[PDB]
């Protein structure tokens, strides 16, 4: 709305590697996340196809399509409730203390639903899981929502 | 692995646990036709290679161009010099230096 | 001529010019040879060294005389550069017949007869093309080390 | 035709080591390749013999024979299709990724058909094959067609 | 610009300004090159160095010209700082493919083509990302050491 945030246009100049002021359709998922929006990858996929837009063939972009797609994704930020994120992992391990065994969270984050690479899974556990093999998800989900 | 080579019909045969199976005189005929067809396919694929092969030789020959010269001239010096008073002198002396 | 090689020739010019006036005369040649152990150095050897110059041996006349005799002189690091390109896998001294074929077949300076003279004081390994490195030493500083 | 390319005559002066403006029949194969033509060595051999020309005895040349032999070889450049070069090597190794094991391509290029020396085979693999012993022929055939 | 780097440029300014008046003219450039061994230094090379300035080469004009060409110049201790963070376990030179992937995937300055130019004079180890340290040397002081 501007509140006209012109820093979204300045961040589009940091993600366009050619400097022509266009951003390919394959970068739009990760740049919506870097502007403070977490649409799921199936949602980013649907919307695209919904608009008869094929992410399979070469793509370019213009700021005039990327701005309204970020504004259509911005209504879905009401789905980001931290009660359900901590209660999900509280149902994932027994006893009254928030600890996932290391390999349980790593294999679930790579193979269940939207596949996260094991390189990204190791980069999200690095520091929050110590050598006991127990990830405290009270501080883990706190630090994941700090970015 | 062997049958890898040859301008032979890679059809006409068939392998199995204890042995290969081979056609003659029909399958024999087949292969033959096939054989010619690879010379084509092959003969043409050889060429480029051959071509290309030497094409890399030129890139090396050329690079080398000067490194030789350097080597070339450089030696010659020595053959001339090594017999020169002044140069022997420098030689015995070259060490006392720092 | 790199600048450290010119400083080495300036230090050799100062060790042969024992009068320190900047011009090596025949007395400097004889007194440098006598200080190296040559008590029998003839005057005809000193006259043949001075007969290679058109004037007195000052620093620029000594540099131009050495330049004109060393028109293909190569420092040890550039000779080892070229021998590391001939042995691109490192460590190994290259074969005798490979250096004889590649000297001849690339250039006229690598013709055989010259290759027999290369083997002839540059010994076997050196000649053969197997060792390496001792030949770079004796091309920058002559005689057996 | 001239398009009269007079640089073919200037390249003949770079390959004639005597400066008399003649190029021996043994150099004509490699100089057709250096002018942008890839005739196979059996083809260069046949044509020669076809014309009762013996490459076994001393030979000289003149520009007036080398020009029409390069123009007879120039029609055969329609045989250089890169689909068949990459599909040849794709049938040469299993799995869905373009990698030949080092020694498979080296022994096939030296002993199968027109014999390439192992010195030339090592000069064509140098840089494209790393220490894993796997030659990626997608980039290997790309760089071989860059010259 | 750290102050010891500015003192190094003040010492280089005094070695090229052999008249010691504070302004490097074309005669100072030619006499510094002749004292390094350049007897054939053309006047067009001296004119191209003076054509990079809008005025006489005093100490602040030499510092602003070097500042504008070295806008990403990094001292050896900060380059080794960043390479110790890339190899956080110490001692080991980092892999060739790890530096190619991390240069590209983080930044546009680490794009490949540029990575082929990095391997191209920064040799293998350096290029590969295995050794380390020789590249910090040649980024603060160029040419082969």
XYZ file of C-alpha atoms in Angstrom:
682
model
C 0.000 0.000 0.000
C 3.114 1.989 0.555
C 2.462 2.107 3.713
C 4.346 2.009 0.411
C 7.269 -0.293 1.142
C 9.735 0.571 -1.616
C 12.310 -1.750 -0.042
C 10.553 -4.681 -1.745
C 11.662 -3.170 -5.054
C 15.173 -2.664 -3.714
C 15.278 -6.316 -2.661
C 14.202 -7.320 -6.172
C 17.354 -5.614 -7.428
C 19.380 -7.775 -5.030
C 17.869 -11.018 -6.333
C 17.996 -10.241 -10.047
C 21.383 -11.474 -11.245
C 21.121 -9.828 -14.687
C 20.232 -6.308 -13.502
C 17.347 -5.978 -16.056
C 14.720 -5.634 -13.256
C 13.094 -9.019 -13.880
C 13.035 -12.033 -11.572
C 12.397 -15.547 -12.887
C 9.364 -17.475 -11.669
C 11.573 -20.025 -9.898
C 12.963 -17.321 -7.602
C 9.558 -15.940 -6.595
C 8.969 -18.607 -3.936
C 12.206 -17.856 -2.095
C 11.881 -14.089 -2.495
C 8.396 -14.066 -0.989
C 9.971 -15.801 1.979
C 12.761 -13.211 2.076
C 10.199 -10.378 2.140
C 8.531 -11.831 5.237
C 6.004 -14.274 3.787
C 5.818 -18.034 4.238
C 3.614 -19.538 1.492
C 3.986 -23.306 1.199
C 5.636 -24.546 -1.996
C 2.434 -26.244 -3.198
C 0.619 -22.946 -2.768
C 3.266 -21.111 -4.767
C 2.961 -23.882 -7.339
C -0.842 -23.788 -7.524
C -1.207 -20.069 -7.795
C 1.303 -20.122 -10.658
C -0.529 -22.868 -12.586
C -3.863 -21.408 -11.525
C -2.851 -18.388 -13.652
C -1.801 -20.668 -16.631
C 1.826 -19.874 -15.738
C 4.312 -22.666 -16.442
C 7.388 -22.826 -14.207
C 8.691 -25.603 -16.495
C 9.677 -23.294 -19.365
C 11.882 -20.198 -19.283
C 10.425 -17.323 -17.266
C 11.112 -13.673 -16.720
C 9.537 -11.223 -14.565
C 8.468 -7.922 -14.065
C 7.911 -6.119 -10.918
C 4.280 -5.499 -11.979
C 3.430 -9.182 -11.554
C 5.652 -9.902 -8.575
C 4.162 -7.091 -6.491
C 0.520 -8.381 -6.740
C 1.672 -11.999 -6.183
C 3.354 -10.929 -2.940
C 0.171 -9.083 -1.986
C -1.916 -12.190 -2.679
C 0.421 -14.250 -0.501
C 0.360 -11.677 2.312
C -3.178 -12.557 3.419
C -2.089 -16.106 4.184
C 0.281 -15.013 6.973
C -2.586 -15.559 9.458
C -1.812 -19.293 9.161
C 1.508 -18.856 11.046
C 0.456 -19.756 14.601
C 3.229 -20.827 16.959
C 0.879 -22.699 19.298
C 0.363 -25.369 16.688
C 4.053 -25.574 15.811
C 5.133 -26.315 19.367
C 2.168 -28.617 19.985
C 2.981 -30.571 16.817
C 6.431 -31.412 18.149
C 5.044 -31.955 21.665
C 2.894 -34.777 20.280
C 5.951 -36.142 18.450
C 7.875 -37.203 21.576
C 6.909 -38.743 24.940
C 7.431 -37.313 28.458
C 7.006 -33.762 29.752
C 10.028 -32.084 28.167
C 10.424 -30.743 24.647
C 13.070 -32.971 23.027
C 13.024 -34.701 19.644
C 15.642 -37.374 19.038
C 17.977 -36.016 16.318
C 17.242 -38.450 13.486
C 13.470 -38.332 14.019
C 13.259 -34.669 13.101
C 15.827 -34.972 10.332
C 14.070 -37.814 8.526
C 10.629 -36.266 9.005
C 11.732 -32.894 7.630
C 13.310 -34.482 4.568
C 10.697 -37.101 3.653
C 7.310 -36.003 5.012
C 5.298 -33.713 2.776
C 7.312 -30.946 1.165
C 10.770 -32.481 0.832
C 13.485 -30.452 2.516
C 17.006 -31.418 1.486
C 19.168 -33.011 4.154
C 21.638 -30.160 3.643
C 18.948 -27.678 4.724
C 17.869 -29.956 7.567
C 21.428 -30.023 8.933
C 21.648 -26.232 8.639
C 18.454 -25.870 10.697
C 19.588 -28.191 13.517
C 23.167 -26.909 13.697
C 23.581 -25.305 17.111
C 20.232 -26.204 18.688
C 20.978 -29.907 18.907
C 23.955 -30.845 21.071
C 25.804 -34.199 21.302
C 23.113 -35.833 23.483
C 21.047 -36.362 20.308
C 18.111 -34.422 21.766
C 16.734 -31.315 20.112
C 14.950 -28.973 22.493
C 12.135 -27.672 20.305
C 11.068 -24.978 22.754
C 14.238 -23.074 21.920
C 14.429 -24.614 18.437
C 11.066 -23.224 17.301
C 11.870 -19.959 19.051
C 15.025 -19.549 16.961
C 13.262 -20.670 13.778
C 10.724 -17.887 14.316
C 13.514 -15.381 15.014
C 14.252 -15.100 11.290
C 33.116 -55.969 -23.066
C 34.876 -57.234 -26.184
C 31.984 -57.013 -28.496
C 32.145 -53.347 -27.618
C 34.205 -52.901 -30.799
C 33.648 -53.898 -34.441
C 31.399 -52.574 -37.169
C 29.153 -55.672 -36.340
C 25.341 -56.140 -35.793
C 24.947 -55.835 -32.044
C 21.604 -57.581 -32.565
C 22.627 -60.874 -34.080
C 24.000 -62.071 -30.759
C 22.809 -62.592 -27.263
C 24.476 -63.364 -24.061
C 23.615 -65.556 -21.193
C 25.001 -67.260 -18.123
C 27.311 -69.673 -19.880
C 27.564 -68.460 -23.383
C 26.756 -66.136 -26.175
C 24.288 -66.813 -28.756
C 24.920 -65.931 -32.321
C 23.010 -66.013 -35.615
C 24.500 -67.313 -38.842
C 22.987 -67.583 -42.245
C 20.279 -65.052 -42.026
C 21.061 -63.400 -38.834
C 24.451 -63.588 -40.416
C 23.084 -61.593 -43.264
C 21.522 -59.092 -40.958
C 24.679 -58.281 -39.090
C 26.564 -57.750 -42.294
C 24.211 -55.035 -43.354
C 24.551 -53.759 -39.922
C 28.294 -53.868 -40.176
C 28.239 -51.558 -43.151
C 25.909 -49.332 -41.297
C 28.335 -48.572 -38.620
C 31.237 -47.810 -40.860
C 28.867 -45.045 -41.905
C 27.810 -44.348 -38.391
C 31.240 -45.244 -37.269
C 33.478 -43.995 -40.040
C 31.815 -40.627 -39.589
C 32.155 -40.757 -35.844
C 35.728 -41.700 -36.167
C 36.682 -38.774 -38.343
C 35.453 -35.987 -36.011
C 37.360 -37.667 -33.265
C 40.491 -37.925 -35.427
C 39.893 -34.373 -36.478
C 39.279 -33.233 -32.983
C 42.160 -35.189 -31.798
C 44.641 -33.224 -33.693
C 42.736 -30.031 -33.050
C 43.985 -30.290 -29.440
C 47.456 -30.920 -30.604
C 47.584 -27.637 -32.304
C 46.477 -25.906 -28.929
C 49.393 -27.582 -27.255
C 51.971 -27.068 -30.025
C 51.117 -23.426 -29.977
C 51.236 -23.003 -26.162
C 54.597 -24.650 -26.193
C 55.749 -22.180 -28.827
C 57.662 -19.997 -26.533
C 58.500 -22.204 -23.601
C 60.719 -23.964 -26.038
C 62.518 -20.867 -27.256
C 63.111 -19.994 -23.706
C 64.564 -23.333 -23.268
C 66.185 -23.117 -26.703
C 68.165 -19.935 -26.390
C 68.781 -20.393 -22.674
C 70.953 -23.446 -23.157
C 72.942 -22.004 -25.982
C 74.021 -19.153 -23.671
C 75.568 -21.447 -21.255
C 77.435 -23.425 -23.846
C 79.158 -20.261 -24.797
C 79.558 -18.741 -21.490
C 80.686 -21.646 -19.356
C 84.081 -21.344 -21.109
C 84.412 -17.495 -20.374
C 86.881 -16.353 -17.644
C 84.549 -13.746 -16.373
C 81.809 -16.190 -16.122
C 83.825 -18.778 -14.271
C 84.908 -16.046 -11.975
C 81.349 -14.994 -11.235
C 80.784 -18.610 -10.625
C 83.374 -19.264 -7.977
C 82.442 -15.913 -6.561
C 78.634 -16.133 -6.780
C 78.612 -17.916 -3.493
C 80.442 -15.529 -1.177
C 77.550 -13.234 -1.883
C 74.382 -12.724 -0.038
C 67.368 -9.268 -17.245
C 65.508 -9.321 -13.957
C 66.679 -6.816 -11.339
C 68.122 -9.375 -8.893
C 70.238 -10.830 -11.695
C 71.521 -7.335 -12.427
C 72.312 -6.912 -8.728
C 74.250 -10.190 -8.849
C 76.300 -8.812 -11.730
C 76.838 -5.600 -9.751
C 78.189 -7.622 -6.838
C 80.456 -9.614 -9.141
C 81.622 -6.354 -10.701
C 82.538 -5.025 -7.256
C 84.457 -8.185 -6.336
C 86.529 -8.011 -9.516
C 86.951 -4.239 -9.268
C 89.152 -4.185 -6.180
C 90.171 -0.544 -6.688
C 86.478 0.432 -6.282
C 86.559 3.212 -8.893
C 83.948 1.715 -11.219
C 86.225 0.456 -14.015
C 87.737 -3.024 -14.057
C 91.236 -2.752 -15.466
C 93.748 -5.559 -16.115
C 95.244 -5.253 -12.620
C 91.818 -5.924 -11.082
C 91.424 -9.025 -13.228
C 94.831 -10.333 -12.179
C 94.364 -9.549 -8.473
C 90.933 -11.170 -8.399
C 92.365 -14.285 -10.029
C 95.296 -14.307 -7.602
C 92.855 -14.055 -4.679
C 90.993 -17.096 -6.035
C 94.239 -19.093 -6.255
C 95.512 -18.278 -9.744
C 99.176 -17.468 -9.237
C 100.011 -18.346 -12.850
C 97.353 -16.239 -14.618
C 98.936 -15.078 -17.876
C 98.659 -11.527 -19.177
C 97.303 -12.857 -22.463
C 94.180 -14.118 -20.682
C 93.592 -10.680 -19.216
C 94.164 -9.116 -22.623
C 91.636 -11.481 -24.232
C 88.991 -10.449 -21.711
C 89.677 -6.781 -22.409
C 89.648 -7.493 -26.170
C 85.959 -8.430 -25.903
C 85.135 -4.808 -25.054
C 85.487 -1.664 -27.146
C 86.155 0.462 -24.058
C 86.935 0.284 -20.340
C 84.926 -2.213 -18.302
C 82.542 -0.052 -16.323
C 79.236 -1.428 -15.047
C 77.249 -0.771 -18.243
C 79.981 -2.152 -20.502
C 80.100 -5.294 -18.395
C 76.308 -5.594 -18.551
C 76.188 -5.158 -22.327
C 78.961 -7.698 -22.863
C 77.180 -10.252 -20.690
C 73.857 -9.422 -22.369
C 75.280 -10.117 -25.824
C 76.714 -13.486 -24.752
C 73.669 -14.511 -22.714
C 70.897 -13.781 -25.218
C 69.102 -17.021 -24.279
C 69.991 -17.147 -20.577
C 67.114 -18.411 -18.481
C 66.725 -18.288 -14.696
C 66.239 -21.558 -12.816
C 62.579 -20.891 -11.978
C 61.587 -20.516 -15.625
C 63.541 -23.602 -16.658
C 61.751 -25.560 -13.934
C 58.490 -23.990 -15.110
C 59.027 -25.459 -18.582
C 60.112 -28.825 -17.146
C 56.986 -28.953 -14.963
C 54.941 -28.450 -18.121
C 56.871 -31.320 -19.714
C 56.164 -33.405 -16.631
C 52.670 -32.113 -15.790
C 51.932 -34.811 -13.198
C 54.850 -33.644 -11.043
C 57.829 -35.325 -9.330
C 59.027 -37.634 -12.134
C 62.014 -36.938 -14.329
C 60.982 -37.303 -17.958
C 62.274 -40.007 -20.336
C 65.406 -39.741 -22.443
C 63.715 -40.567 -25.737
C 60.811 -38.216 -25.072
C 63.080 -35.201 -24.778
C 65.050 -36.227 -27.860
C 61.913 -36.585 -29.952
C 60.273 -33.405 -28.665
C 63.407 -31.298 -29.119
C 63.872 -32.395 -32.688
C 60.211 -32.500 -33.768
C 59.261 -29.162 -32.630
C 62.239 -27.097 -33.362
C 65.492 -26.960 -35.278
C 67.300 -26.036 -32.026
C 66.387 -29.484 -30.708
C 68.049 -31.277 -33.805
C 69.862 -34.529 -32.819
C 73.854 -33.771 -32.985
C 73.037 -31.029 -30.496
C 71.196 -33.661 -28.426
C 74.387 -35.741 -28.268
C 76.198 -32.666 -26.982
C 73.435 -32.188 -24.409
C 73.951 -35.710 -23.105
C 77.728 -35.211 -23.187
C 78.420 -33.177 -20.181
C 74.977 -33.014 -18.862
C 75.249 -36.395 -17.831
C 72.825 -39.445 -18.274
C 69.883 -38.564 -16.149
C 70.140 -34.973 -17.346
C 70.896 -36.031 -20.924
C 68.282 -38.823 -20.821
C 65.655 -36.358 -19.514
C 64.875 -38.392 -16.409
C 66.307 -36.159 -13.686
C 65.617 -32.760 -13.734
C 66.675 -29.772 -11.945
C 70.427 -30.324 -11.928
C 70.434 -29.103 -15.524
C 68.605 -25.922 -14.471
C 71.299 -25.413 -11.862
C 74.196 -25.781 -14.302
C 72.516 -23.596 -16.953
C 72.331 -20.684 -14.513
C 75.660 -21.511 -12.897
C 78.040 -23.644 -14.970
C 80.479 -26.471 -14.119
C 79.862 -29.557 -12.004
C 78.285 -28.762 -8.649
C 33.627 -18.996 -53.538
C 35.299 -16.036 -51.983
C 32.626 -15.440 -50.274
C 36.274 -15.654 -51.316
C 38.039 -16.665 -48.116
C 41.651 -15.686 -48.796
C 42.577 -16.640 -45.229
C 42.751 -20.282 -46.363
C 45.720 -19.269 -48.510
C 47.250 -17.374 -45.605
C 46.891 -20.465 -43.425
C 48.654 -22.517 -46.105
C 51.636 -20.209 -45.652
C 51.587 -21.012 -41.926
C 51.682 -24.773 -42.517
C 54.294 -24.838 -45.272
C 57.645 -25.147 -43.510
C 59.720 -24.483 -46.650
C 57.973 -21.266 -47.742
C 57.664 -22.463 -51.409
C 53.817 -22.371 -51.264
C 53.366 -26.148 -51.407
C 51.966 -28.427 -48.713
C 52.714 -32.158 -48.665
C 49.855 -34.641 -48.984
C 50.406 -35.882 -45.424
C 49.578 -32.436 -44.026
C 46.336 -32.041 -45.986
C 44.284 -34.095 -43.519
C 45.249 -31.948 -40.532
C 44.986 -28.679 -42.448
C 41.452 -29.445 -43.600
C 40.651 -29.876 -39.930
C 42.363 -26.573 -39.116
C 40.259 -24.776 -41.754
C 37.031 -25.965 -40.121
C 36.439 -29.347 -41.750
C 36.297 -32.767 -40.118
C 36.762 -35.472 -42.788
C 37.539 -38.885 -41.317
C 41.042 -40.203 -41.996
C 39.733 -43.066 -44.162
C 37.870 -40.521 -46.256
C 41.000 -38.423 -46.678
C 42.801 -41.641 -47.563
C 40.206 -42.821 -50.094
C 39.833 -39.581 -51.930
C 43.621 -39.456 -52.302
C 43.880 -43.001 -53.708
C 40.645 -42.498 -55.617
C 42.598 -39.865 -57.591
C 45.609 -42.286 -58.098
C 47.511 -40.186 -55.538
C 50.002 -42.110 -53.400
C 50.653 -40.764 -49.899
C 53.404 -43.406 -49.587
C 55.915 -41.604 -51.815
C 57.175 -38.024 -51.572
C 54.498 -35.403 -52.203
C 54.307 -31.699 -52.801
C 51.485 -29.478 -53.245
C 50.105 -26.674 -54.832
C 47.369 -24.499 -53.721
C 45.470 -25.335 -56.945
C 44.869 -28.902 -55.773
C 44.436 -28.185 -52.081
C 41.694 -25.617 -52.662
C 39.375 -28.036 -54.608
C 40.102 -30.869 -52.123
C 38.958 -28.620 -49.272
C 35.871 -27.738 -51.309
C 35.122 -31.424 -51.892
C 35.440 -32.083 -48.164
C 33.227 -29.109 -47.266
C 30.005 -30.814 -48.375
C 30.537 -33.558 -45.819
C 30.198 -31.169 -42.854
C 26.469 -32.045 -42.736
C 27.530 -35.296 -41.027
C 28.552 -33.405 -37.841
C 25.397 -33.783 -35.729
C 25.823 -33.351 -31.979
C 22.669 -35.310 -31.129
C 24.337 -38.513 -32.212
C 27.598 -37.705 -30.436
C 25.955 -37.251 -27.049
C 23.593 -40.188 -27.593
C 26.540 -42.426 -28.502
C 28.142 -41.788 -25.123
C 24.750 -41.958 -23.379
C 24.409 -45.554 -24.583
C 27.976 -46.231 -23.408
C 27.258 -45.892 -19.668
C 24.358 -46.872 -17.384
C 22.158 -44.608 -15.205
C 20.665 -41.190 -15.943
C 23.787 -39.024 -15.787
C 26.412 -38.441 -18.461
C 29.608 -39.998 -17.061
C 32.072 -42.355 -18.739
C 34.579 -44.106 -16.499
C 38.028 -42.707 -17.421
C 39.676 -45.809 -18.880
C 36.603 -46.802 -20.910
C 36.792 -43.703 -23.071
C 40.578 -43.767 -23.247
C 40.815 -47.351 -24.485
C 37.900 -46.930 -26.895
C 39.368 -43.777 -28.437
C 42.756 -45.410 -28.937
C 41.743 -48.869 -30.183
C 38.293 -48.649 -31.784
C 38.226 -47.688 -35.443
C 40.556 -44.848 -36.348
C 43.382 -45.219 -33.833
C 43.980 -42.099 -31.770
C 47.287 -42.084 -29.909
C 47.103 -42.260 -26.135
C 48.988 -38.954 -26.034
C 46.115 -37.295 -27.922
C 43.549 -39.108 -25.780
C 45.141 -37.719 -22.610
C 45.195 -34.225 -24.122
C 41.452 -34.466 -24.843
C 40.487 -35.611 -21.327
C 42.809 -33.235 -19.465
C 40.596 -30.867 -17.489
C 37.185 -32.427 -18.157
C 37.864 -35.542 -16.122
C 38.560 -34.963 -12.433
C 39.990 -37.403 -9.842
C 36.687 -39.288 -9.404
C 37.468 -41.147 -12.655
C 34.201 -39.989 -14.229
C 34.115 -37.940 -17.403
C 30.991 -35.833 -17.786
C 30.403 -36.031 -21.532
C 27.719 -33.353 -21.555
C 30.405 -30.762 -20.877
C 33.091 -32.890 -22.547
C 31.366 -32.951 -25.949
C 30.457 -29.297 -25.504
C 34.132 -28.366 -25.120
C 35.180 -30.674 -27.964
C 32.767 -28.814 -30.239
C 34.070 -25.454 -28.989
C 37.164 -25.783 -31.177
C 42.947 2.037 4.396
C 44.803 1.089 7.550
C 47.626 3.420 8.584
C 50.488 0.976 7.910
C 49.195 0.470 4.373
C 49.201 4.238 3.922
C 52.773 4.331 5.233
C 53.694 1.663 2.675
C 52.275 3.875 -0.064
C 54.218 6.821 1.369
C 57.428 4.804 1.150
C 56.643 3.749 -2.412
C 55.882 7.376 -3.242
C 59.292 8.403 -1.909
C 61.099 5.703 -3.906
C 59.445 6.805 -7.142
C 59.840 10.499 -6.320
C 63.621 10.656 -6.575
C 63.682 14.471 -6.657
C 62.113 14.465 -3.146
C 59.895 17.512 -3.751
C 56.571 15.763 -3.175
C 55.362 15.484 -6.790
C 56.138 12.510 -9.015
C 56.734 13.805 -12.517
C 57.498 11.800 -15.681
C 61.261 11.981 -15.082
C 60.814 10.299 -11.691
C 58.799 7.517 -13.291
C 61.466 6.934 -15.931
C 64.394 7.069 -13.483
C 62.701 4.675 -11.077
C 62.071 2.250 -13.926
C 65.660 2.603 -15.134
C 66.904 1.858 -11.602
C 64.803 -1.326 -11.593
C 66.310 -2.435 -14.920
C 63.974 -0.867 -17.480
C 66.291 0.724 -20.012
C 63.637 0.576 -22.738
C 60.731 2.202 -20.852
C 58.749 4.147 -23.459
C 57.461 7.668 -22.894
C 53.961 6.513 -23.784
C 53.884 4.306 -20.682
C 54.806 7.267 -18.515
C 52.171 9.372 -20.252
C 49.509 6.711 -19.632
C 50.293 6.722 -15.916
C 50.018 10.508 -15.808
C 46.788 10.330 -17.858
C 45.122 8.504 -14.955
C 45.393 11.675 -12.853
C 43.753 15.064 -13.309
C 46.726 16.846 -11.735
C 50.314 16.354 -10.569
C 51.044 13.190 -8.598
C 51.489 14.424 -5.053
C 50.887 12.130 -2.083
C 47.121 12.724 -1.860
C 46.607 12.361 -5.615
C 48.501 9.082 -5.532
C 46.412 7.901 -2.579
C 43.111 8.805 -4.239
C 44.108 7.109 -7.491
C 45.070 3.925 -5.652
C 41.910 4.155 -3.528
C 39.692 4.302 -6.610
C 41.378 1.262 -8.190
C 41.561 -0.735 -4.956
C 37.980 -0.359 -3.721
C 37.886 -4.034 -2.679
C 41.515 -4.447 -1.601
C 41.839 -6.642 1.457
C 44.876 -7.135 3.701
C 46.263 -10.650 4.129
C 45.086 -11.004 7.737
C 41.443 -10.383 6.837
C 41.596 -12.736 3.866
C 43.023 -15.424 6.151
C 40.317 -14.539 8.677
C 37.639 -15.349 6.098
C 39.455 -18.518 4.992
C 39.708 -19.693 8.611
C 35.948 -19.272 8.857
C 35.603 -21.345 5.684
C 37.898 -23.942 7.221
C 36.803 -23.658 10.870
C 38.664 -26.781 12.020
C 42.005 -25.254 11.020
C 45.023 -26.386 8.960
C 43.260 -27.929 5.938
C 42.917 -26.242 2.584
C 39.278 -26.345 1.521
C 37.933 -28.307 -1.472
C 37.744 -27.012 -5.022
C 34.060 -27.762 -5.501
C 33.110 -26.293 -2.131
C 34.504 -22.888 -3.015
C 32.892 -22.979 -6.453
C 29.486 -23.791 -5.018
C 29.714 -21.305 -2.148
C 30.925 -18.465 -4.367
C 28.118 -18.918 -6.829
C 25.305 -19.753 -4.391
C 25.759 -16.932 -2.118
C 26.651 -14.128 -4.357
C 26.686 -12.948 -7.947
C 30.400 -12.071 -7.554
C 31.087 -15.787 -7.103
C 29.306 -16.685 -10.509
C 31.115 -19.508 -12.408
C 33.026 -17.797 -15.560
C 34.712 -15.697 -12.886
C 35.556 -18.954 -11.074
C 37.359 -20.207 -14.192
C 39.369 -16.992 -14.188
C 40.140 -17.547 -10.504
C 41.552 -20.987 -11.255
C 43.432 -19.584 -14.261
C 46.343 -17.875 -12.763
C 45.692 -18.731 -9.235
C 46.745 -22.054 -9.883
C 45.143 -25.510 -8.956
C 45.432 -25.662 -5.236
C 44.511 -21.985 -5.051
C 41.849 -22.329 -7.744
C 40.609 -25.657 -6.322
C 40.351 -24.099 -2.830
C 42.626 -26.668 -1.205
C 45.678 -24.548 -0.405
C 45.251 -21.442 1.077
C 47.304 -18.559 1.928
C 49.260 -18.187 -1.300
C 46.172 -16.521 -2.754
C 46.105 -14.048 0.151
C 49.723 -13.268 -0.620
C 49.132 -12.591 -4.319
C 45.974 -10.533 -3.656
C 47.944 -8.112 -1.478
C 51.055 -8.326 -3.638
C 50.526 -9.519 -7.214
C 52.538 -11.766 -9.581
C 54.058 -15.168 -8.873
C 56.107 -15.240 -5.684
